[PDB]
Design a protein around this ligand. Structure first.
Ligand SMILES: [Mg+2]
Ligand SMILES: [Mg+2]
Ligand SMILES: [Mg+2]
Lengths: 467, 467, 233
């Protein structure tokens, strides 16, 4: 039903003005320019200081947000090149000749892969939970001020909505355009095409805040999508993200010493759904075949485990990528329909069982490790303390009450980034409490772990008198 | 004279064996597989912990080795897409239809850009100097043991030779194949096509060690190059590296507060060679035009400086990339000649003056800053101390003398990575002193700054008794 | 022979159990090492141990257990089976070769080598050496202990040497205090008039002093005397 011409729109939200000497496009496609904008953005560089699952201070070659984003972008680019160079006839039909698929599709997939975790809060996924908990305690639902469902945007805070806000509105210049990405890129960024105001069963989480609602509507009007309808490339991006999660987190678990290659092999073999899975069987057979020859040479146990898991990563990534591409090619008609109800691309692929088993292994071995839980608790404490300390200086700034006029409150307000306060002080139609909570959410989400800890310690030192 | 068929060889050094179920290539080109291998390599992840010029501990969004490598790879990929999609007729002539330029050239340029600084020693360029100095003191030229010119490989240690060694021989498996990259990629990695044994005026530094000499010869035999002849894409990679250096280092200098946007504008305007340069004039005019409108809005001085330098980065990168592409297209015949004598691509382009002025500004403002010099001295002290401490346990291991049999020496030897010692203990034709020095160089070059400091402190604590 | 066989069995089995407990390896790693070992591929004892371990591990994974708990009790079962098999093999070997052991010209090096559990014990020793004895932390603590011992030995020799030969370089206050810090019985034996050479007596006094100390006591004494040796250094 949907057309690739609208889904691959290269237009930008910002209206065109500019002489020829100011043209920086050169021989680059618009989506390629979007990818370059995302790569050179300051949050992209700041992602290196944010932990993914495991601490980054140790020199164990663990993967941070930046490395994970680059790997997801590479996988998405590979899938895009496969689609645009081999499966062009099967996938892309009735596409106008003005669209260069070979230059747009890989660039689009890489751009949406690189930016998928750019606005996430620090301290990993736990961070989000902490934020939600804080809001759930500080924006009570029973209270009349925070009774509306819009405040759910903060009680169920999600990194995807903050990422969309950061790439569309949250920039230094308050032009409501941000990086000014193309319509196709912005449409692909929206993972869940719904808000907290709307109630849907297909999508659990909300994909955008109230403040960006109009922007999202514009994107839909320029893309042909609608509420509850997800862009086809978002499925590919989510599948690549899930594959990277399941495989590279297991690799990091083995590298960190929480488990071994033989433990993972036994877990996969003894898994209920992986006993008869063809993909899992092939991966296990290839791993054992390489491991026999690998043990022939003289290698230390650590080296043997490391390269055995490298081979496992190669085989698993290849199989999962092939399965995802096949599933996308087979169900292309359903994805292009306005009434698509597919939850994820992996479940329709043959690598569903392997990915589920890898996720279970990662959860049981890595995510629930004692050190991981301890650092998650420490990060939650840091985030909640900083949020209380900032709320001491944020609350009442828009409603009218003046309990923030203390010197500590003024200093805390001044410590927030200037662009966030500039957006907060703007006169819009958002409720004052919503604006205050959004300011706090933007301040917290934009910080790295080291920056958050340093600011928390500094303001704790400066909060001694008023406590 | 040279043919693109040989220069874009997709064959690999490792002889082919493997069932169809073990085929992980899928719909990926061989050079794309090389790029994926480079991206997923452990040193690529370890590059995030190595500083480029400025410290990475501060959350000032400075660029490390990984970020710089990714930016260089992106620029090289953009140039490759421009060459393969627009300037195909002008550049690529008499190319066989079996080579897909649109999928190989951008992938090749991105792969060689990402790996260009993967084997460099820690603590930035100063690190190399420190290593050289240490070797110059510990491998005396007057001594009969270290009189041959081959030991110059260590007295004039270069990161490019170590990078080639690390991607060709220095892996966990001692198969003399490493990542098993394609011949085109390996040929493009060689920046200076000469060794320390040979004396040349076109190239100052050597590009490969003695141990890899045969490998390099094989690459030449499979690529059509020879000694003193540089692969055409190496010029593009070096130009992209120089552009990234000159522009992003200036951006980091402005961000760190060592200078301001107006200081850079005045330096460019008052530069002797940039007073009449068209590229510099256009960049300055565009910067001022954007800065007037930028000061119209209400922005903090830091925010104004930051986005003004962002605009300067955009304009400068666009102009320099366009100039480099034009220069490469114009001088394509000379680059394909077996007697090419061009030192660099930038000098033949119209952005030579702007790049030189940016390099001078970076040297005067950033590289010679007091903090940068202090950290360079600290890194040099750390490197030299660790090198002496390791040499206490390395020297004599191959010559025959047994002064290393002390418990501290044995522990120090055991602390070195297992693959390095496995390569060192292999029976080859290299001189024993050369093997020992190469083991030390491989051990030092493979460490990050944090790892090097931690190991230095630990072994200093453990060296108290023997001192 | 029986005592040495029991010591070797305890070494090979309980050190592997400690390695698994400390997290340096896992139960599956040990199972794979035993299965892929050159001499344990056809050993009946090793085969029986592996089969029993896998049979118990299947039922053990039926219940809801954490990975650490599963590894711990799987290695407990492995310890039980291995100790039972090795003890039975050692007893059988001792019973069979009792006449040779009672001979005045016995040339048997150890009881385990004559038993059927020789291959399993050798594989366990190799696993312990490769995984536990050569671990980075173990090597670091071994180097630290060697440094402590050598420093304490030099510091004591400063006050011990010459006490019996006749030379009087020990008469420094630090030397006298160091001599006084040694246990009284060791010095009483050293000062006794016997036929041992004076240098031998001095070295034996130092060896007795060093061997009788625990790790904590040795470290504390080393630190204290290092603090007290500042002036004379
Ligand atoms: Mg992700
Ligand atoms: Mg560089
Ligand atoms: Mg014993």
């Amino acid at each position: 039903s949907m057309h690739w011409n609208d889904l691959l729109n290269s237009n930008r939200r910002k209206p065109k003005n500019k002489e020829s000497s100011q043209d920086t496009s050169k021989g680059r496609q618009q989506i390629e320019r979007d990818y370059d904008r995302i790569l050179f953005a300051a949050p992209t560089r700041r992602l290196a200081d944010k932990t993914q699952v495991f601490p980054l201070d140790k020199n164990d070659s663990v993967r941070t947000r930046l490395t994970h984003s680059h790997e997801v972008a590479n996988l998405s680019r590979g899938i895009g090149m496969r689609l645009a160079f081999e499966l062009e006839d099967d996938v892309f039909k009735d596409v106008s000749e003005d669209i260069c698929l070979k230059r747009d599709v890989p660039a689009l997939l890489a751009a949406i892969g690189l930016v998928h975790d750019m606005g996430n809060p620090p301290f990993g996924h736990q961070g989000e939970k902490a934020m939600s908990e804080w809001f759930t305690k500080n924006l009570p639902e029973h209270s009349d001020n925070y009774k509306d469902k819009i405040y759910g945007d903060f009680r169920h805070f999600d990194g995807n909505s903050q990422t969309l806000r950061l790439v569309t509105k949250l920039q230094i210049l308050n032009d409501t355009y941000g990086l000014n990405l193309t319509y196709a890129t912005l449409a692909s960024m929206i993972k869940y095409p719904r808000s907290s105001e709307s109630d849907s069963s297909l999508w659990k989480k909300h994909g955008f805040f109230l403040s960006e609602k109009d922007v999202v509507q514009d994107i839909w009007n320029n893309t042909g999508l609608s509420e509850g309808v997800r862009h086809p490339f978002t499925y590919i991006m989510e599948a690549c993200d899930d594959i990277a999660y399941s495989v590279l987190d297991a690799e990091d678990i083995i590298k960190k010493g929480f488990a071994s290659f033989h433990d993972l092999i036994d877990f996969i073999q003894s898994n209920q759904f992986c006993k008869e899975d063809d993909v899992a069987k092939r991966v296990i057979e290839n791993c054992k075949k390489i491991h026999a020859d690998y043990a022939q040479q003289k290698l230390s146990p650590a080296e043997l485990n490391d390269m055995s898991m490298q081979m496992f990563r190669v085989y698993a990534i290849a199989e999962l990528v092939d399965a995802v591409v096949i599933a996308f090619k087979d169900n292309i008609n359903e994805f292009l329909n306005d009434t698509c109800e597919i939850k994820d691309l992996i479940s329709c692929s043959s690598g569903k069982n392997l990915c589920q088993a890898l996720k279970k292994f990662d959860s049981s071995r890595g995510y629930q490790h004692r050190s991981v839980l301890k650092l998650e608790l420490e990060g939650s404490n840091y985030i909640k303390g900083l949020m209380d300390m900032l709320w001491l200086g944020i609350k009442g700034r828009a409603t009218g009450d003046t309990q923030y006029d203390t010197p500590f409150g003024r200093y805390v307000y001044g410590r927030i980034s200037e662009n966030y306060r500039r957006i907060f002080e703007q006169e819009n139609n958002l409720p004052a409490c919503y604006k205050e909570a959004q300011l706090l959410a933007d301040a917290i989400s934009g910080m790295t772990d080291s920056y958050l800890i340093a600011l928390h310690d500094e303001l704790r030192a400066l909060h001694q008198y008023e406590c």
